[PDB]
Design an enzyme around this catalytic site. Sequence first.
Site, PDB file in Angstrom:
ATOM      1  N   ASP A  18       0.841  -1.190   0.000  1.00 16.76           N
ATOM      2  CA  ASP A  18       0.000   0.000   0.000  1.00 16.76           C
ATOM      3  C   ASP A  18       0.880   1.245   0.000  1.00 16.76           C
ATOM      4  O   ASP A  18       1.822   1.347   0.794  1.00 16.76           O
ATOM      5  CB  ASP A  18      -0.922  -0.015   1.218  1.00 16.76           C
ATOM      6  CG  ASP A  18      -1.946   1.109   1.200  1.00 16.76           C
ATOM      7  OD1 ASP A  18      -2.103   1.769   0.153  1.00 16.76           O
ATOM      8  OD2 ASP A  18      -2.598   1.332   2.243  1.00 16.76           O
ATOM      9  N   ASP A  60      -8.351  -2.576   3.479  1.00 14.19           N
ATOM     10  CA  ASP A  60      -8.526  -1.899   2.198  1.00 14.19           C
ATOM     11  C   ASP A  60      -9.759  -2.408   1.463  1.00 14.19           C
ATOM     12  O   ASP A  60     -10.506  -1.611   0.884  1.00 14.19           O
ATOM     13  CB  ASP A  60      -7.283  -2.085   1.328  1.00 14.19           C
ATOM     14  CG  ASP A  60      -6.038  -1.474   1.945  1.00 14.19           C
ATOM     15  OD1 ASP A  60      -6.158  -0.451   2.652  1.00 14.19           O
ATOM     16  OD2 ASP A  60      -4.937  -2.020   1.723  1.00 14.19           O
ATOM     17  N   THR A  93      -3.819   4.631  -3.332  1.00 12.29           N
ATOM     18  CA  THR A  93      -2.740   5.437  -2.772  1.00 12.29           C
ATOM     19  C   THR A  93      -1.520   5.466  -3.684  1.00 12.29           C
ATOM     20  O   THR A  93      -0.814   6.480  -3.735  1.00 12.29           O
ATOM     21  CB  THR A  93      -2.349   4.907  -1.394  1.00 12.29           C
ATOM     22  OG1 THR A  93      -1.893   3.555  -1.512  1.00 12.29           O
ATOM     23  CG2 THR A  93      -3.536   4.957  -0.441  1.00 12.29           C
ATOM     24  N   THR A  94      -1.249   4.369  -4.396  1.00 14.61           N
ATOM     25  CA  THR A  94      -0.138   4.349  -5.342  1.00 14.61           C
ATOM     26  C   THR A  94      -0.519   5.035  -6.649  1.00 14.61           C
ATOM     27  O   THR A  94       0.318   5.694  -7.278  1.00 14.61           O
ATOM     28  CB  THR A  94       0.304   2.909  -5.604  1.00 14.61           C
ATOM     29  OG1 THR A  94       0.689   2.290  -4.370  1.00 14.61           O
ATOM     30  CG2 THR A  94       1.481   2.869  -6.574  1.00 14.61           C
TER      31      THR A  94
HETATM   32  N1  LIG Z   1      -7.476  -9.159 -12.019  1.00 18.64           N
HETATM   33  C1  LIG Z   1      -7.412  -7.922 -12.567  1.00 18.64           C
HETATM   34  N2  LIG Z   1      -7.754  -7.709 -13.856  1.00 18.64           N
HETATM   35  C2  LIG Z   1      -7.698  -6.486 -14.418  1.00 18.64           C
HETATM   36  N3  LIG Z   1      -7.299  -5.388 -13.748  1.00 18.64           N
HETATM   37  C3  LIG Z   1      -6.927  -5.453 -12.447  1.00 18.64           C
HETATM   38  C4  LIG Z   1      -6.964  -6.757 -11.771  1.00 18.64           C
HETATM   39  N4  LIG Z   1      -6.552  -6.547 -10.509  1.00 18.64           N
HETATM   40  C5  LIG Z   1      -6.272  -5.225 -10.381  1.00 18.64           C
HETATM   41  N5  LIG Z   1      -6.497  -4.573 -11.539  1.00 18.64           N
HETATM   42  C6  LIG Z   1      -6.298  -3.118 -11.763  1.00 18.64           C
HETATM   43  O1  LIG Z   1      -5.074  -2.695 -11.162  1.00 18.64           O
HETATM   44  C7  LIG Z   1      -5.285  -1.615 -10.249  1.00 18.64           C
HETATM   45  C8  LIG Z   1      -4.488  -1.899  -8.984  1.00 18.64           C
HETATM   46  O2  LIG Z   1      -4.926  -1.116  -7.877  1.00 18.64           O
HETATM   47  P1  LIG Z   1      -4.281  -1.444  -6.442  1.00 18.64           P
HETATM   48  O3  LIG Z   1      -2.790  -1.563  -6.644  1.00 18.64           O
HETATM   49  O4  LIG Z   1      -5.026  -2.596  -5.810  1.00 18.64           O
HETATM   50  O5  LIG Z   1      -4.557  -0.119  -5.576  1.00 18.64           O
HETATM   51  P2  LIG Z   1      -3.303   0.724  -5.030  1.00 18.64           P
HETATM   52  O6  LIG Z   1      -2.629   1.177  -6.301  1.00 18.64           O
HETATM   53  O7  LIG Z   1      -3.932   1.840  -4.232  1.00 18.64           O
HETATM   54  O8  LIG Z   1      -2.507  -0.269  -4.220  1.00 18.64           O
HETATM   55  C9  LIG Z   1      -6.785  -1.499 -10.020  1.00 18.64           C
HETATM   56  O9  LIG Z   1      -7.201  -0.131 -10.086  1.00 18.64           O
HETATM   57  C10 LIG Z   1      -7.428  -2.333 -11.114  1.00 18.64           C
HETATM   58  O10 LIG Z   1      -8.069  -1.506 -12.091  1.00 18.64           O
END
Ligand SMILES: Nc1ncnc2c1ncn2[C@@H]1O[C@H](COP(=O)(O)OP(=O)(O)O)[C@@H](O)[C@H]1O
Lengths: 50, 191, 535
Positions: free
Chosen positions: C62, C401, C95-96
């Site tokens: 995170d 989260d 957040t990222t």
């Molecule tokens: N299985 C998946 N298939 C397609 N897109 C995905 C999948 N898992 C995550 N994503 C995309 O990747 C992004 C990753 O966000 P995440 O890293 O969980 O939040 P943060 O960047 O705040 O840690 C999400 O916004 C989503 O759109």
Amino acid sequence: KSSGRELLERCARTAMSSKLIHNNADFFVKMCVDAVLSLDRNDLDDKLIG
Amino acid sequence: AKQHENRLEDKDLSDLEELEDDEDEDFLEAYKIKRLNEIRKLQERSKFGEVFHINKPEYNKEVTLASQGKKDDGGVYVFVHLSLQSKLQSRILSHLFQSAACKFREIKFVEIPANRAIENYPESNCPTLIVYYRGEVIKNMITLLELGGNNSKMEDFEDFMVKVGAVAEGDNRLIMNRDDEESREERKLHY
Amino acid sequence: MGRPFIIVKDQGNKKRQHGLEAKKSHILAARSVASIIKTSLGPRGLDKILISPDGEITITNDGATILSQMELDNEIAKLLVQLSKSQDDEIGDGTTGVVVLASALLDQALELIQKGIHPIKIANGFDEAAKLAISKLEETCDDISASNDELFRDFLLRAAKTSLGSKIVSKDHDRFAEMAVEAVINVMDKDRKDVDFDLIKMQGRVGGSISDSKLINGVILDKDFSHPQMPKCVLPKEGSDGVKLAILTCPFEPPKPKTKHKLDISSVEEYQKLQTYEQDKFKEMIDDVKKAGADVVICQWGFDDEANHLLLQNDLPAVRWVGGQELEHIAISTNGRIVPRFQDLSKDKLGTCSRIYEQEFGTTKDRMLIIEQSKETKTVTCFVRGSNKMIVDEAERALHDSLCVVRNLVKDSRVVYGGGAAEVTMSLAVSEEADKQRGIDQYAFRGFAQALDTIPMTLAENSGLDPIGTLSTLKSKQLKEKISNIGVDCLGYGSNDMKELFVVDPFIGKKQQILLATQLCRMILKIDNVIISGK
Ligand SMILES: Nc1ncnc2c1ncn2[C@@H]1O[C@H](COP(=O)(O)OP(=O)(O)O)[C@@H](O)[C@H]1O
Ligand SMILES: [Mg+2]
């Protein structure tokens, strides 16, 4: 013989320049204008706007 | 240089009257009014004088709020005692609290059972002595082997109060400075 | 004039910066912060190791947890610490992305700073582009409120699996996603729903494996009974299946006042009288509890010794020393209310529980109670496990989260479909309007367009796919077809349509990435003088 509400919005628009607000001034200028109008005209206080 | 300072510094309000016939009035009475004001401050600060046998809900107030006092940073020292009646050192330390309470009325003397203080406290670590001041722990003292252990005396306890800043070094109430009247009587004769 | 020339104190440690080169270090300093967390974006991310000064270690991905509790020197990175944090407190997700999107706006804005356009005029272009971008996303947004509760139950899994998929908890995403959804079913009102987040507690024990984690309905306690001879598991008898849990603020002790007091004890007549006083008090005490009919009594403070045995005689177990903050949560789940004193104790204010048991955990000398409820109660408490201390903290944060992601679905049912589909949809919307509104701010619209493209290119970079074929396919396809739910497939599936892949994101979460980014970068660009007093 203009309206009194538009007077505060007109002068407050100048204050919101040279800040981060100047593009979002359409929404926040209504906040401070309506906020100060709720105060009493005779006794306008600076501590009630915390 | 110290010979001029010993006339006023080394004499209380009762001892300053000795120099009434010898020293000048304006030199003496100017300092007696100063020392008289200091005596009045200690009387106003004398909010205590017996051991406060408290309980936990209250700890969150008596021990800590007091430590803030007026909050003029009017701090107040609060000596806590986690008592344990089975231990021999705990009953000795309880006697020292009541003895010191009758003398030092400005310092708060607090007592509570150790079993009721902390969840599942080690009985071997009791008796425990904590000293709060302005909400902060000044000293987390362990069992009295540092203070002689079973042979702890009132003189050793009063010396510990001077180290933590609770009582001044040259205080007239301390047994180290409170010389006996017979001792001072022999000094005047042999002088 | 003399050789000394002083205006402010400590001029040697204070040093200013100015000009174009001073602003150049700020955007390039954001690239170092962005490049660290650039690899952790998407499902193919990799965690970061953190080390505190006290030696405590934790691992996470995170962005707010990474940037938090870190020693920094530059002020601009500290603003990114407050950024990610911002998104976390309110949203708890993205957040990222907000930091990478904020750095993307700064990287595209530097080229323009290099041409001779004023920095405030650049930020004005992003504001008109951002409002047009969010307005266009709202136009192509689908609402799921018209469906019934059965289909709406499934939509929570589609979004809960998304946020849990980007963590280490995704080994069984079908299993642990039910934990995040079943906890919200017990608090929703089914009409003008509010989450009531404060009721949902969350605690994890270090022990066992993560597969043994099971959701419960009650309160988790980290303390033992008043005496170990009491029975571990306590069941109800023939009628009144609720155990009648009595909760107490004042413990089993002698009554006395708060103020200082000395009880004057006379000759032997009064000494023998006070022995009968406290002995009749305990007899009055045990008769008062048995009159109320309680089976379990808990106080915030320890009972006296004699008192620990007197409860054990009548088959009346007791827990002692229950935290003050923990005591209030027990009454809400049991549909009870805490009595101020013992004289007001009656039948109406007692609790109700299905069953309790004292759970052992290996050879350790600790005891935990686990309250369970057969029917739907108010609160709910998570029960997380794991084979490490940090993996439980990671599972708690990953579940937290996901708990905040589904929290947005309750207050706002209008959802979106991210994963590069919303970014490319919002990028071409401002690009098609750039050549219509050439003016002088067209380069700001193009910079805002290329800044949005860095997110799906980052997902393409982490997934190993070619950004050329990925970016060209999305731009060419989305310009042709109006369907706007096609993005970057990172897991390597054969179809890029996200209707079948079970991925859903909230609108309030994806909106805040653009708002907090474009509003921060206005502040970053408006800095000219940079004075840093050396410590
Ligand atoms: N299985 C998946 N298939 C397609 N897109 C995905 C999948 N898992 C995550 N994503 C995309 O990747 C992004 C990753 O966000 P995440 O890293 O969980 O939040 P943060 O960047 O705040 O840690 C999400 O916004 C989503 O759109
Ligand atoms: Mg996430």
